[PDB]
Design a binder for this molecule. Structure first.
Ligand code: HEM
Ligand code: HEM
Ligand code: HEM
Ligand code: HEM
Lengths: 140, 146, 140, 146
């Protein structure tokens, strides 16, 4: 359960990220693959080297999913239903892996938004990413 | 755990820039704020009702200093984190009964603090090096459960 | 998301447990304390030895919460709201611990209902307990 | 990991009653059924569309036999699970990249199978002994990540 304050915090961070979102999405993916190499197994047809056009393009998709969650934060289960089906049924994504990506997403925000990554906003973001992760693992 | 020389390099170089009087407290505070159940073990610290109370709490800063002390020690003995953390493991496991998953969480929080403080300098390869480090520390600290 | 089949499976197991529920609740607690001694820290004012009247009485409370979840399975968040507040705000229960108790609950059912603990019902029960756990950790 | 003699007793005595041709397959099947993402690593096994397909799948039973084989081996070398599982750890970690949390899950599934099969005989103290065992096996199997 995200609080009203959590909602405004997340919205504010999102707003400050601005048009970098897609690029930050790609960065979070890279940080994930390098830090937690087991996750790479899910992208065997992707070239995952630095500068990969595939990782770039995919990061925008990931960012786009997250902003859609932010914009419909009061009904994430509905907004992310198609994506939750994909991740559980088709991809069979291990639930642990959502924690790994969520951490990389926080790191990325932290490395880019010094003013916004306060302890409070950090808490709000972590809750937001845990809720998104809960939805995306709700369909096994 | 085994870091490459390039990773040992990436790690030690950044760590030399860390403010050892601040970062420990910054990480402990966030742990308490982001994962509030951890506050369970720190009730003697006093006001923890708000993030501002937590982060400005002088006990939090002082105890954080000791916590970073241990991470520094671990950085000093990467190839023997188990011996380094034996005593702390007895304390955290046999005495305190902290669930070892919170060792992983604190390590990740520290990583977020480093990212925050170092920004662009905290590159994906540098983070990867640090992830091996905090994972090694959590594993050593959890030895008494194993 | 519990399926219609999950719902009937859980209901069926619940039904077969019958009036043993309170006693099985106490047993699950005991199995938890013995198997995962870290959990004992949360009950420092309880005597946790075998036969403890406190563990017995509490097991019924636990069982009662679970049956209430079963009986309102289509609105667990509402049914368990007061209990979720307690567990997060007041008790500060570590999220890992819900997995430990959920496992002990499955073991207990398995040790008592040989005909019902099929792989399918096992799956349905695990999902049911994970949903209850999600609700009880939704309030930090 | 260290079991007491009473625990070693509790464990080995029950294990002597285990059907080694069945229980491995029963546990692997449930793993695949209860935690479906694990099916990701077993696509060559064929029909896994339903629980009945999984549990009656002859590949599942045959491969389960090997899995129990390893648990039996671990029971044989409680005081050296690390050496016992070195090769399997290379396989599961370096080769397969299975997340080590699934090692814990399989151990817990095995525990549920034992409970099912032994009922009242699978007492809370007996389960506690087995929990130390499966935890020790998951930790050894995960060594290559550490
Ligand atoms: C915050 C959590 C996540 C979000 C928001 C997210 C978002 C997305 C989106 C938007 C897509 C493309 C969907 C489409 O094309 O219809 C996608 C695909 C995919 N995701 Fe995720 N994802 C998340 C977590 C994960 C994790 C943890 C993994 C694995 C470790 C993962 C692995 C994949 C894979 C393998 C694909 C398909 C890529 C391809 O074959 O083109 N995702 N995800
Ligand atoms: C990487 C993980 C951790 C490290 C390196 C670490 C390090 C330390 C250090 C250096 C001390 C001071 C020891 C002394 O005073 O001699 C300490 C004490 C303490 N830690 Fe941690 N710690 C970790 C994780 C945790 C977590 C996650 C919790 C709770 C959620 C926790 C709870 C405590 C408590 C309650 C004390 C005070 C014990 C006492 O003085 O009686 N620790 N820790
Ligand atoms: C399936 C998940 C759980 C259920 C259904 C459950 C249910 C309950 C219920 C019904 C109560 C009494 C509520 C009241 O009196 O208003 C309670 C209290 C309590 N629970 Fe839980 N619980 C669960 C998980 C846990 C876990 C994982 C822990 C700790 C490891 C825990 C620790 C406690 C404690 C310490 C109390 C208060 C006992 C006392 O001081 O009297 N619970 N729980
Ligand atoms: C306690 C945990 C585990 C034990 C004791 C165990 C044991 C074994 C054994 C004995 C083998 C056969 C080795 C051989 O053929 O020489 C094997 C193979 C295999 N395991 Fe496991 N395993 C465990 C966990 C897991 C999990 C959780 C997964 C997936 C979710 C997994 C995936 C596989 C796969 C895909 C193979 C076939 C590898 C190949 O033949 O190429 N294992 N395991």
């Amino acid at each position: 359960v995200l609080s009203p304050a959590d909602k405004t915090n997340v919205k504010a961070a999102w707003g400050k990220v601005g048009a970098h979102a897609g690029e930050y999405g790609a960065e979070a993916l890279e940080r994930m693959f390098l830090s937690f190499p087991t996750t790479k197994t899910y992208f065997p047809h992707f070239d995952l080297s630095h500068g990969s056009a595939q990782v770039k393009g995919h990061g925008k998709k990931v960012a786009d999913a997250l902003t859609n969650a932010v914009a419909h934060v009061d009904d994430m289960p509905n907004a992310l239903s198609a994506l939750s089906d994909l991740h559980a049924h088709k991809l069979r994504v291990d639930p642990v892996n959502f924690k790994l990506l969520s951490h990389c997403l926080l790191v990325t925000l932290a490395a880019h938004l010094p003013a916004e990554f306060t302890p409070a906003v950090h808490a709000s973001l972590d809750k937001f990413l845990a809720s998104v992760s809960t939805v995306l693992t709700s369909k096994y | 755990v085994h870091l490459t020389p390039e990773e040992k390099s990436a790690v030690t170089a950044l760590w030399g820039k860390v403010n050892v009087d601040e970062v420990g407290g910054e990480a402990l505070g966030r742990l308490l704020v982001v994962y509030p159940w951890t506050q369970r073990f720190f009730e003697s610290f006093g006001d923890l009702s708000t993030p501002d109370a937590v982060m400005g709490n002088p006990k939090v800063k002082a105890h954080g200093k000791k916590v970073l002390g241990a991470f520094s020690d671990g950085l000093a003995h990467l190839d023997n984190l188990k011996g380094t953390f034996a005593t702390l493991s007895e304390l955290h496991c046999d005495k305190l009964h902290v669930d070892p998953e919170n060792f992983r969480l604190l390590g990740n929080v520290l990583v977020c603090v480093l990212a925050h403080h170092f920004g662009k300098e905290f590159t994906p390869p540098v983070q990867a090096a640090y992830q091996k480090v905090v994972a090694g520390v959590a594993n050593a600290l959890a030895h008494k459960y194993h």
